[PDB]
Amino acid sequence: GHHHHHHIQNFRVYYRDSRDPIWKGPAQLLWKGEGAVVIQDKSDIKVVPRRKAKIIRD
Amino acid sequence: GHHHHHHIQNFRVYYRDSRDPIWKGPAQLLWKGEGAVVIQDKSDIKVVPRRKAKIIRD
Amino acid sequence: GHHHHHHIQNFRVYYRDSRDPIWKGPAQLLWKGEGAVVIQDKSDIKVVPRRKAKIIRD
Ligand code: NI
Ligand code: NI
């Protein structure tokens, strides 16, 4: 059914996908753990290695 | 696309949201991390720190 | 809102649904935690204990 993944308030994330060196974002933070991060960028929810993500506390 | 996050069977979760002292729930458990849990309450999927969550075995 | 959970590239997962002994899949891998994995099988996103999942790097 329809649902919404509420982001972790007061955080924004810049990230890189796979091997592309371009920074993407800012994006929302959904989860962090196991040396990885879950981000939501518009309608796309992606898993990114922690060192491929810059987390910023607004 | 359209999808459903199936809850972890035989568990319910009461949780505290943001700055409201009243407990919400019972909600579904989607994921149990070491420091936080992912819950689903109706169409809302939220990340709650373990200290603000009460996992019930039913 | 509408969104898509992008899978972790180059992984295929076979799994069992709790009691049912029949193997299901191939499914996409969304998250590999400690003790469990999150998989997507068409419209269903499920949490599977690690012992009940076979992750294949292809
Ligand atoms: Ni729709
Ligand atoms: Ni979803």
UniProtKB/TrEMBL annotation, chains A, B, C:
The entry's DNA-binding region: 11-58
Domain of life assignment: Viruses
Limits of the Integrase-type domain: 11-58
Annotated compartments: Host cell membrane; Host cytoplasm; Host nucleus; Virion
Name of the featured protein: Gag-Pol polyprotein
Gene: pol
Residues shown, of full length: 220 to 271 of 289
